[PDB]
Amino acid sequence: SHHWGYGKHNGPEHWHKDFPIAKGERQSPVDIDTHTAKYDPSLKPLSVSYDQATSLRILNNGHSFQVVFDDSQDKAVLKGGPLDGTYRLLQFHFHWGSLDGQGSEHTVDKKKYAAELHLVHWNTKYGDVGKAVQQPDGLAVLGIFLKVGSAKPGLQKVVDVLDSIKTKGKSADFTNFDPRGLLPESLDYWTYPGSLTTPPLAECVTWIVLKEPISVSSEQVVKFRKLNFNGEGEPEELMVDNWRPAQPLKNRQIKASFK
């Protein structure tokens, strides 16, 4: 135990000691009970504007890998849906399992998906992400489920560089990556107020979870599972099962954009 992770001695059941908000009133992820979520005709269609996105780097950050974007202008922005104002894309990352029957953070009628993609955006009215994480409407995370079947062609560029970032601290140039290639057809979604799913567990996120999963191939997710939690020179621990389980809903309402 010590610095946080996903292991027996430092995983999700330990996080509350360093981050007491772990037991807070609006923690994430949650189970999405599809029959209880209420269709809200007042919600808007989600506006996902990624045409001008500028990817920078790909990084193994010890807990996942992330692709980072230039967020110094309104290039790649999320608006509409449940959101007021404009949210800039900062990065995306994934959570995944050791086997295909677990890996997602959100669940749908208790179903776990093989993985979950998070595209993290911050509200421009707070000026920078560090300020945004201190606000209840600071961040919008677009969550997308992954199931195993056919390959996702738009993911392959990511998959093919993972061998260059095997261990914690490694990064690589990752320019000209188009995150539109990671999106499903439909933008139908569920939304609720929640939190970051990792330390610091800040209660600053409007969650937007797409109903339609993307399909990835077994070869694609196998390459995720070859990443290491450990740094180079340390005992090899596969980066798998880097997901937080569902947390209590606590009288929050999950709303559906669709009937």
Q: Annotated binding residue at 118?
A: yes
Total residues binding Zn ion (CB under 5 A): 1
The residue with its CB nearest to Zn ion is 118
Q: How many angstroms separate the CA atoms of 87 and 90, rounded?
A: 9
Q: Indicate if 63 belongs to the active site.
A: yes
On the CB side of 124, CA atoms within 13 Å amount to 15
Q: Annotated binding residue at 2?
A: no
Taking CA atoms, 172 is separated from 179, 186, 193, 246, in Å, by 17, 32, 34, 33
Q: Annotated binding residue at 36?
A: no
Smallest distance from the beta carbon of 251 to Zn ion, in angstroms?
Answer: 24
Smallest distance from the beta carbon of 66 to Zn ion, in angstroms?
Answer: 9
Greatest C-alpha distance within the chain: 55
> How crowded is residue 178: how many other Cβ atoms within 10 Å of its Cβ?
13
Q: Does residue 200 have a cis peptide bond before it, meaning omega lies within 30 degrees of 0?
A: yes
Q: Does 118 bind Zn ion (CB under 5 A)?
A: yes
Q: Does 244 bind Zn ion (CB under 5 A)?
A: no
Q: What's the token pair of residue 104?
A: 């997602």
Which residue number, 126 or 207, has a Cβ lying nearer to Zn ion?
207
Q: Annotated binding residue at 191?
A: no
What residues line the site for Zn ion (CB under 5 A)? 118
Catalytic residue list: 63
Binding site per annotation, positions: 93, 95, 118, 197-198
Binding site per annotation, positions for Zn(2+): 93, 95, 118
Binding site per annotation, positions for substrate: 197-198
